[PDB]
Amino acid sequence: VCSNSSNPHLATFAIPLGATQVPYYCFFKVDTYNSTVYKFLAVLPPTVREIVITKYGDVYVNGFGYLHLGLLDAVTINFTGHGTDDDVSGFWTIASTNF
Amino acid sequence: VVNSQGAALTQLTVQLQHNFQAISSSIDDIYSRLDILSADVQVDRLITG
Amino acid sequence: EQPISFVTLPSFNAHSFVNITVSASFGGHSGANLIASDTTINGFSSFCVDTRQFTISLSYNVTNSYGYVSNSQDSNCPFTLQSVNDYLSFSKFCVSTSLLASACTIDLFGYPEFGSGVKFTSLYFQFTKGELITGTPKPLEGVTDVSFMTLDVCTKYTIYGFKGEGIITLTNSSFLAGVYYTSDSGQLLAFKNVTSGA
Amino acid sequence: LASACTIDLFGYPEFGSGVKFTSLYFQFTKGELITGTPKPLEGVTDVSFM
Amino acid sequence: HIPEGFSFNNWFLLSNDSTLVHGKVVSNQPLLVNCLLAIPKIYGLGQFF
Ligand SMILES: *[C@@H]1O[C@H](CO)[C@@H](O[C@@H]2O[C@H](CO)[C@@H](O[C@@H]3O[C@H](CO[C@H]4O[C@H](CO)[C@@H](O)[C@H](O)[C@@H]4O)[C@@H](O)[C@H](O[C@H]4O[C@H](CO)[C@@H](O)[C@H](O)[C@@H]4O)[C@@H]3O)[C@H](O)[C@H]2NC(C)=O)[C@H](O)[C@H]1NC(C)=O
Ligand SMILES: *[C@@H]1O[C@H](CO)[C@@H](O[C@@H]2O[C@H](CO)[C@@H](O[C@@H]3O[C@H](CO[C@H]4O[C@H](CO)[C@@H](O)[C@H](O)[C@@H]4O)[C@@H](O)[C@H](O[C@H]4O[C@H](CO)[C@@H](O)[C@H](O)[C@@H]4O)[C@@H]3O)[C@H](O)[C@H]2NC(C)=O)[C@H](O)[C@H]1NC(C)=O
Ligand SMILES: *[C@@H]1O[C@H](CO)[C@@H](O[C@@H]2O[C@H](CO)[C@@H](O[C@@H]3O[C@H](CO[C@H]4O[C@H](CO)[C@@H](O)[C@H](O)[C@@H]4O)[C@@H](O)[C@H](O[C@H]4O[C@H](CO)[C@@H](O)[C@H](O)[C@@H]4O)[C@@H]3O)[C@H](O)[C@H]2NC(C)=O)[C@H](O)[C@H]1NC(C)=O
Ligand SMILES: *[C@@H]1O[C@H](CO[C@@H]2O[C@@H](C)[C@@H](O)[C@@H](O)[C@@H]2O)[C@@H](O[C@@H]2O[C@H](CO)[C@@H](O[C@@H]3O[C@H](CO)[C@@H](O)[C@H](O[C@H]4O[C@H](CO)[C@@H](O)[C@H](O)[C@@H]4O)[C@@H]3O)[C@H](O)[C@H]2NC(C)=O)[C@H](O)[C@H]1NC(C)=O
Ligand SMILES: *[C@@H]1O[C@H](CO)[C@@H](O[C@@H]2O[C@H](CO)[C@@H](O[C@@H]3O[C@H](CO)[C@@H](O)[C@H](O)[C@@H]3O)[C@H](O)[C@H]2NC(C)=O)[C@H](O)[C@H]1NC(C)=O
Ligand SMILES: *[C@@H]1O[C@H](CO)[C@@H](O[C@@H]2O[C@H](CO)[C@@H](O)[C@H](O)[C@H]2NC(C)=O)[C@H](O)[C@H]1NC(C)=O
Ligand SMILES: *[C@@H]1O[C@H](CO)[C@@H](O)[C@H](O)[C@H]1NC(C)=O
Ligand SMILES: *[C@@H]1O[C@H](CO)[C@@H](O)[C@H](O)[C@H]1NC(C)=O
Ligand SMILES: *[C@@H]1O[C@H](CO)[C@@H](O)[C@H](O)[C@H]1NC(C)=O
Known part of the structure; x- marks a missing residue:
């Protein structure tokens, strides 16, 4: 949950x-x-391009690995994807990466 | 032979990063975090190696 | 008179006070022997920090006929009781009086000068390396970003958990990856201002 | 026991605090007369098989 | 396998600490792909993975 003041x-x-x-x-x-x-960790960086999440709980932002967590099994994603919003969609590509 | 003579210098920096049975390879890091006795022993090991 | 520079990840003032309190008496049992000893972490047997900035405080409450009790600390962890107030960075930090897995033991000894000294208790620290927890000697008042530094002068700097001595300068380079850059000598020569990109 | 290592068991009931149930001590010597198998062998005259 | 002829502008190396300014290295990295979704619409309906 992120908010602008x-x-x-x-x-x-x-x-x-x-x-x-x-x-x-x-x-x-x-x-x-x-x-x-509710916990606070950091402020939003001005630019975010690539976000990676692993099965072992490791999250990587701009090739840093900011935080690490425990075992993960599933996830849910929601935004204003109302069919016609894909033109200004914030997600370019989503793939199933493998080591 | 030109690459042979130009070599044998880069690896000299490498062993500095190597830790000799010490907490860390940075002497300044060790000296300001742990008591003087064991830090002195560890830096003696470092300098000897 | 070396100026001190301290820069970490940009965050606001989230300060907390962690307190360990020890209370015991010696003059009732035998002078050289205790009667009762209680140790409290903010009035509790165990605690875990949550805020980014925390300050440790240890309090002694000892009673004896002589009136003087020598205090000694047995250390096994990489940090001592007072060294934690020297801009130390961590990720997870928990303190308890009972045994915990992967936790070192720190001992406190009291010598009331009666001839015999005793160990009050044992402290257990479960700590992980990281950035989200910072240990400062004092809270910062009216500060929006804890990071502060001085440029173009020799200074004792503590950047991202690494402490060194040098002159810091600004470079006109652009890079979109990483937060610091290191060479094969273990020296963190180049670091980036995440807020501005400099 | 003398010359015996210690193995610890810890239980965390997810209530916030975990405790150590007990400690186990093993006095062991290298040799051949004792063998540890995952399951018993049924109708076997010689345990060796290859 | 990933096809050749890509700028990889929005891609970065997976690093726990520091980054190589310039050079070469071999390591296990998340590069093998099973499926790819682009120009998306469906995650606005609470997509589950
Ligand atoms: C940055 O720092 C993080 C730490 O936060 C490192 O993350 C670790 O990465 C390693 C490498 O992947 C992880 O190790 C993996 O553990 C898996 C879980 O182990 C279970 O399964 C094995 C059997 O494989 C059991 O023996 C074991 O008891 C566990 O039950 C292993 O399964 C992995 O090995 C196998 O993985 C898959 C599984 O099919 C195979 O395809 C592989 O070929 C391989 O055989 C692997 O060993 C480790 O868990 C991570 N730790 C954490 C905390 O996340 C990063 O590696 C480090 N560096 C970078 C660049 O990020
Ligand atoms: C964990 O440990 C910390 C550190 O000791 C404790 O914080 C201290 O708390 C005590 C009281 O319990 C404070 O002592 C007195 O506090 C009064 C009110 O406190 C507020 O105001 C002070 C500043 O005055 C703040 O530091 C504090 O956080 C509160 O916002 C003050 O009015 C008293 O001031 C008197 O003494 C000073 C110094 O001599 C004089 O300048 C004043 O004029 C006045 O005479 C006094 O300070 C103490 O200040 C606190 N220290 C700090 C650093 O915060 C925690 O309470 C403790 N928590 C737990 C759970 O154990
Ligand atoms: C590089 O690293 C540095 C290291 O900290 C960080 O610098 C950030 O950006 C600027 C650079 O100095 C600083 O923040 C800005 O400060 C301005 C001046 O601060 C006060 O100055 C006087 C006191 O001397 C006050 O009277 C005055 O009112 C200012 O508050 C402010 O003008 C900026 O915004 C302020 O005004 C607006 C007006 O509406 C308010 O709404 C704001 O809340 C704020 O009060 C701004 O605060 C500071 O050094 C760093 N700011 C941060 C971290 O937020 C950065 O990390 C990086 N540099 C940059 C540019 O990102
Ligand atoms: C330094 O420590 C002393 C010792 O108190 C205690 O010592 C250990 C036994 C251990 O429990 C410590 O945690 C604890 O500090 C402090 O002196 C008294 O401390 C007690 C706290 O236990 C205070 O409150 C008391 O609580 C008791 C339990 O409910 C209660 O029975 C007491 O009432 C009785 O108090 C005295 C005995 O102390 C008795 O004569 C009375 O007649 C009454 O029944 C009491 O409510 C006390 O207020 C503290 N002070 C006194 C004078 O007793 C001390 O405060 C602490 N700090 C210093 C010295 O700065
Ligand atoms: C990725 O994000 C960018 C940034 O928003 C998206 O660009 C946006 O694209 C849409 C449609 O292509 C633009 O809307 C149209 O813009 C034109 C002017 O170019 C205007 O005349 C139309 O009336 C309409 O508003 C939108 O302006 C543009 N954003 C900006 C800031 O200019 C891009 O589409 C996104 N890509 C994906 C795949 O989602
Ligand atoms: C979670 O643990 C806490 C304490 O063990 C309990 O949660 C409480 O549940 C009741 C009833 O739903 C609420 O009224 C309380 O507010 C809850 N506590 C807190 C701190 O919020 C309960 O035992 C557990 N809840 C589960 C298992 O659902
Ligand atoms: C964030 O700013 C935008 C303006 O661009 C505003 O519309 C929005 O309401 C703000 N966020 C919140 C939670 O109010
Ligand atoms: C960086 O910009 C130019 C070269 O690109 C140089 O002349 C200038 O002095 C530099 N500015 C700095 C280092 O602040
Ligand atoms: C996703 O978020 C939108 C907010 O506009 C909400 O209307 C919708 O119900 C959400 N989807 C799910 C599955 O919760």
Whole structure:
């Protein structure tokens, strides 16, 4: 969940957000069957091109490997893909990469 | 022979990165994080190697 | 009088205080022997940090007839009790008084000068290398980005978990990959300002 | 026990804290008279097979 | 196999730490592809993988 200084609830999680409204402040919500906490890790970089996710929980942004997690099994993706939005779609290509 | 004489210098830098049974290869890193005694022993090992 | 430069990933002021408190008495049992000893981590037996910036604080509460108790620390982890306040970077950090897997042990010893010294307790640290956790000696007030540095002068710098001595300068190079560049000597000569790209 | 290594078992009930149940001690010597097989052999006169 | 004749503008090497400025290296990398989807529309309906 990422927001551009529009945090009705994340402001409670992080009162001193800082910076200004132009940069986007992203957050990871740790949702589970016991708690729904919200964590802050970093601010959105100005440019993002390639994002890689592994089966072992490793996420790579711009060839860095920012964060690592445990075992993964599935994922869900949603945006405004209402048929006619593919022209300005934010995803160019999605592939099943193998080592 | 020209490449043979131009070689045998690059590998001299390599063993600096090698760690000799020490926490890290950077002496400044070790000296400011751990007590003087074991750090001195480890840097003695490093300099001897 | 070396200026100090500290630069990490851009983030706001998220500071927390982790506190270990030890309380014990010596003058009741035998002078050289204790009666009761309690250790609390913010009033709890174990804790785990979550904020990017954290500060450790250790408090002593010892009672004895002599009134003076020598405090000593037995260290096995790569960092000591006070060394953690020297701009240290981690990814996961948890502290407990009980045994935990893949955790080193740090011991605290008290010598009330009565002739015999005793170990109050043992501390266990479960730590992983990383960037999301930073240890600062003091909180930063009115600071939007913790990173601060001085250019074109000799300075003691601590960048991305590596500490060195040198003059730092700006270069007119463009690169879209990586956050730092290293040579075959282990020297991190080139690093990029992620916010600006410089 | 003397000259015995320690093997530890840890249980994490997902409640937030994990504990060590106990410690196991093995006193072992290299040799031939003891063999460890995944399953018993039924109707076998000589365990050797190749 | 990936076809030849690609600029790979939106591709980067998978690195845990640092990056090679210039040179050559061999390592296991995520390059083998099973299927490719481009100009997409369906993930706007909560696509599941
Ligand atoms: C950056 O740092 C990260 C750490 O965060 C490294 O990530 C590790 O990468 C290695 C290499 O892939 C991972 O090791 C893999 O573990 C798999 C899981 O092991 C299970 O299966 C084996 C049997 O194969 C059992 O013996 C074992 O007990 C486990 O049950 C292995 O399966 C992998 O080996 C096999 O993988 C597939 C499976 O079919 C085969 O096709 C392969 O040929 C191979 O035989 C492999 O060993 C490791 O788990 C990762 N760690 C983490 C924490 O994610 C990165 O490697 C490092 N570098 C880079 C560039 O990112
Ligand atoms: C974990 O450990 C930290 C570090 O000790 C604790 O933080 C300290 O908390 C104590 C009180 O429990 C503070 O002592 C007094 O606090 C009063 C109110 O605290 C607020 O204001 C101070 C600044 O004045 C802030 O630092 C603090 O975070 C609160 O926002 C102050 O009014 C007192 O000020 C008096 O002393 C100072 C110094 O002599 C004088 O300048 C003043 O004029 C006044 O006379 C006093 O400071 C202490 O300040 C806190 N230190 C820090 C660094 O925050 C945590 O409470 C503790 N947490 C747990 C769970 O154990
Ligand atoms: C390279 O690395 C440096 C190292 O930190 C980072 O530099 C960022 O960009 C600029 C460069 O200096 C800095 O942020 C900007 O500061 C300006 C001035 O700051 C204050 O100056 C006086 C006090 O001396 C105040 O009175 C004044 O009001 C300023 O607040 C600001 O003008 C910028 O925005 C400010 O004003 C707007 C006006 O609406 C407010 O909305 C903002 O909230 C803000 O108050 C801006 O803040 C700072 O050094 C770094 N900014 C960051 C990290 O956010 C960068 O990492 C990188 N350089 C660049 C350019 O990215
Ligand atoms: C330094 O430590 C002392 C010792 O207290 C305790 O010592 C260990 C046994 C261990 O439990 C420590 O964690 C703990 O600090 C502090 O002195 C007293 O500490 C207690 C905390 O346990 C305070 O509160 C007390 O709590 C008891 C349990 O509920 C309660 O029974 C007490 O009431 C009784 O207090 C005295 C005995 O202490 C007794 O004479 C009374 O008549 C009454 O029944 C009490 O509520 C006390 O308030 C602390 N002070 C006193 C004078 O007892 C000390 O505060 C701490 N810090 C310093 C010295 O700075
Ligand atoms: C990838 O993202 C870019 C950035 O948005 C997309 O470019 C956008 O393309 C659409 C249609 O091609 C443009 O809409 C049309 O623009 C023309 C002017 O060129 C205008 O006359 C029309 O009325 C209509 O608005 C859109 O402007 C353009 N974005 C920008 C910033 O110019 C691109 O299509 C995306 N690619 C994929 C595959 O999704
Ligand atoms: C998750 O663990 C916590 C504590 O063990 C429990 O979650 C509570 O569930 C009740 C009823 O749904 C809520 O009213 C509480 O607010 C929950 N706690 C918290 C901290 O949010 C429960 O045991 C577990 N929940 C599961 C297994 O679904
Ligand atoms: C982010 O900024 C855009 C303007 O480009 C605005 O429309 C949008 O509402 C902002 N985000 C939020 C969560 O308000
Ligand atoms: C970089 O730009 C030009 C060369 O491209 C050079 O003359 C200039 O001095 C440099 N500026 C710096 C290093 O700030
Ligand atoms: C995906 O998000 C849109 C938001 O516009 C929502 O209407 C839709 O129901 C979501 N899809 C699923 C499967 O939740």
